[PDB]
Ligand binder design. Structure first.
Ligand SMILES: O=C(O)CNC(=O)C(=O)O
Ligand SMILES: [Mg+2]
Ligand code: NI
Ligand SMILES: [Zn+2]
Length: 331
């Protein structure tokens, strides 16, 4: 068995290897990358996502989200308070203000210590989930707006044509902006490209050990667990590395820098935080190996998780027993 310790693997494809996305995902899996739940892909030196980032300031963040925490420093939830619209240029200036900027630090490890110590005492503002792309249309390799769609994959694997579309999303971050512990919708893959700015630190639990994280989460968030049988679908709970280590939960960590891709694998729980002003782009995708994970994915039916239009068909076809109750949650 390749990568039996479930370490995060880092890949350096050549420009030739960067041509065929599906093939390269399958290669990484042949080497055991999926066992970690997360992999890093450093693009060939010849590749670029676009020529420059000099003209992005007029992108609108229609609903910036202030991420307000409740709890203790290593075990907290966050809720999102909607703020007034602002441009990327306005948001960048806000991120660099004295109130929100990254503090002085020695190295990524020191910054990580400061994040876990101090996150809860601040409410950073995240520009998340903005439909769009920063890849140039002429970028032919690993262009996250030109991937094969999940609907086409389901149709190729299973023979059933379904409605829905699959487009990318932009994320504009600042110091302390936080992504809570989650797997993807329908336990899909994700791919995330850090276009510019400061790093993003990731934490991940191997897919084979996901249920250990879920059990800890039920213990640590006992009211939320009674409210919903899949409350991590709400994407609000944070648990620190120290708390995970105290409770014996297997996990790994890695920092993504600008110009790097990260891939999350089916049922790989992940969480993390941004180091400072940055912009990332991410999208879900599927491969043949996903189908079995899609069929078994948990679902929120309490009504809180509320997701995209395209998830309907995935539930309806892969999880027909659950369909009824899940759709009651969505309506
Ligand atoms: O970058 C973020 O805020 C969160 N991204 C992801 O969870 C992802 O790419 O799957
Ligand atoms: Mg612009
Ligand atoms: Ni994710
Ligand atoms: Zn729920």
């Amino acid at each position: 068995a390749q990568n039996p310790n479930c370490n995060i693997m880092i890949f350096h494809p050549t420009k030739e290897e960067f041509n065929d996305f599906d093939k390269y995902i399958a290669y990484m899996e042949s080497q055991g990358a999926h066992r970690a739940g997360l992999a890093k892909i450093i693009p060939p030196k010849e590749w670029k996502a676009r020529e420059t980032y000099d003209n992005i300031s007029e992108i609108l963040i229609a609903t910036p989200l202030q991420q307000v925490a409740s709890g203790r420093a290593g075990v907290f939830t966050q809720y999102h308070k909607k703020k007034k619209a602002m441009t990327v240029g306005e948001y960048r200036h806000l991120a660099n203000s004295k109130k929100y900027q990254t503090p002085p630090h020695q190295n990524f490890e020191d910054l990580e210590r400061k994040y876990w110590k101090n996150r809860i005492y601040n409410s950073p503002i995240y520009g998340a989930d903005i439909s769009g792309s920063l890849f140039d249309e002429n970028t032919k390799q690993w262009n996250l707006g030109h991937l094969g769609t999940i609907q086409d994959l389901l149709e190729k694997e299973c023979g059933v044509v379904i409605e829905g579309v699959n487009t990318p999303y932009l994320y504009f971050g600042m110091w302390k902006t936080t992504f809570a512990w989650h797997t993807e919708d329908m336990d899909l893959y994700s791919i995330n490209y850090l276009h510019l700015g400061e790093p993003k630190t990731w934490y991940v639990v191997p897919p084979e050990h996901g249920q250990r994280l879920e059990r800890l989460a039920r213990e640590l968030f006992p009211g939320s667990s009674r409210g919903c049988g899949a409350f991590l679908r709400h994407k609000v709970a944070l648990i620190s590395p120290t708390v995970l280590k105290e409770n014996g939960i297997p996990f790994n960590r890695i920092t993504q820098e600008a110009g790097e891709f990260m891939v999350t694998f089916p049922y790989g729980y992940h969480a993390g935080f941004n180091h400072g002003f940055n912009c990332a782009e991410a999208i879900n995708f599927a491969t043949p190996r996903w189908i079995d994970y899609g069929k078994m994915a948990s679902q929120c039916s309490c009504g809180e998780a509320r997701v995209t239009f395209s998830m309907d068909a995935f539930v309806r076809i892969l999880q027909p027993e659950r369909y009824d109750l899940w759709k009651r949650g969505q309506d």
